[PDB]
Amino acid sequence: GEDSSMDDISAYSSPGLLDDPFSIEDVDISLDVLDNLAPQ
Amino acid sequence: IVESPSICEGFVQASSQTLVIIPDNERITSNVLTTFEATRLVAVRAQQLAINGSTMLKKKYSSPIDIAKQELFNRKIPLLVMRCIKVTPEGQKIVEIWNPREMGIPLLD
Amino acid sequence: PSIMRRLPRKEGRIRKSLLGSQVWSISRSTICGNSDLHLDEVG
Amino acid sequence: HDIEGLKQDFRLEVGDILYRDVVTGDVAFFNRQPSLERSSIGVHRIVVLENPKISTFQMNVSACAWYNADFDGDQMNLWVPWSVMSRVEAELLCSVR
Ligand SMILES: [Mg+2]
């Protein structure tokens, strides 16, 4: 009960945590010309 | 008993077709070229002129596009428009043959 | 890496190589205003 | 054949294909992304800017309505058709008129 060699690696981080509404996934626009989407 | 596959079934090559041309008096499609058909005619004629260059146009132009346009406008283009109406299961391919020398050209010049 | 992983997403085979295309003989630049050009003309 | 490694010919042979520079009056496809309407790709007559210090695609402000574009930093594609078949159809079908 005093051992740390085999502790869970993912448990050292903060414990705990279908379409993304803000992701342009079905919009076919080049990533280098994204300024056309600026609100202006 | 539905048995093992035979050679009668399993053909990949589709059977050949017979071109059935609708008579002129029994045609239903319009007597006016669409912009798509006129553009395709002019493009095909221009490319063929770029290949061959033999034309009967009396005027002289320095571009295949202009010569093709004037040939279409002067009704001297050696092409026909075949409008595929229906492919029948028995094998027939009913189409419509239209002459662009006696149809209205929708283009402008 | 798998054969079927190449298909699905936006960067997949269908949406990036078939439905889209990388082409030659093309140019890109910032656009600008010019009141001396016709509406059917580009500087 | 190159043009710099070939300078011994008086003229050209019939049937050759010449890849010439873009001149004023040529038609070009002119596009802005995203392409939502079918007027987002239109054919414009090219006016070549002889000033070597100009690197932008200049157009009339009244032509922005086709592409939903403005001059806050937008970038637009442009490709000039070279094939005769594609050059014919640009003039007849895809013209911005
Ligand atoms: Mg903008």
- Neighbouring-strand partners of residue B18: B92
Overall resolution, Å:
2.8
Given a contact as 3+ CB pairs under 8 Å, which chains touch C? Answer: A, D
Task: Specify whether the CB–CB gap between C8 and D52 falls below 8 A.
Answer: no
Q: If we measure between CA atoms, which residue out of D5, D77, D10, D74 comes closest to residue D44?
A: D77
Backbone angles phi, psi at B15, to 5 degrees: -65, 150
Q: From CA B62, how far away is CA B42, in angstroms rounded? A: 16
Q: Which technique was the structure solved with, according to the deposited record?
A: cryo-EM
**Strands of C1-43, DSSP E:** 27-33, 41-42
C18 dihedral zone (left: phi>0; alpha: psi -120 to 50; beta): alpha
Say which residue the tokens 């132009």 belong to.
B61
CA of D68 to the centre of ligand 1 (A): 9
Task: Specify whether the CB–CB gap between D71 and C31 falls below 8 A.
Answer: yes
DSSP secondary structure code for residue D88 in this structure: H
In b/e form, how buried is each residue of C7-27, taking b as 16+ CB within 10 angstroms? eeeeeeeebeeeeeeeeeeee
Task: Specify whether the CB–CB gap between D78 and C28 falls below 8 A.
Answer: yes
CB atoms within 10 A of CB B80: 11
Q: If we measure between CA atoms, which residue out of C27, A32, B66 comes closest to residue D46?
A: C27
Task: Specify whether the CB–CB gap between B86 and B52 falls below 8 A.
Answer: no
Give the torsion sign (CA, B21, B22, B25, B27). negative
Residues 6+ apart with CB under 8 A from B49: B55, B64, B67, B68
Q: Cβ separation of C41 and D46 shorter than 8 Å? A: yes
Name the residue type at position B78.
P
Given a contact as 3+ CB pairs under 8 Å, which chains touch B? Answer: D
Q: From CA B21, how far away is CA B2, in angstroms rounded? A: 41
Q: If we measure between CA atoms, which residue out of B14, B17, B20 comes closest to residue B85?
A: B20
Q: For residue B66, what are the CA distances in angstroms to A2, B44, B48, B74, D28? A: 91, 13, 13, 12, 18
The strand pair at D75-79 and B81-87 is best described as unpaired
Give the torsion sign (CA, D43, D44, D48, D53). negative
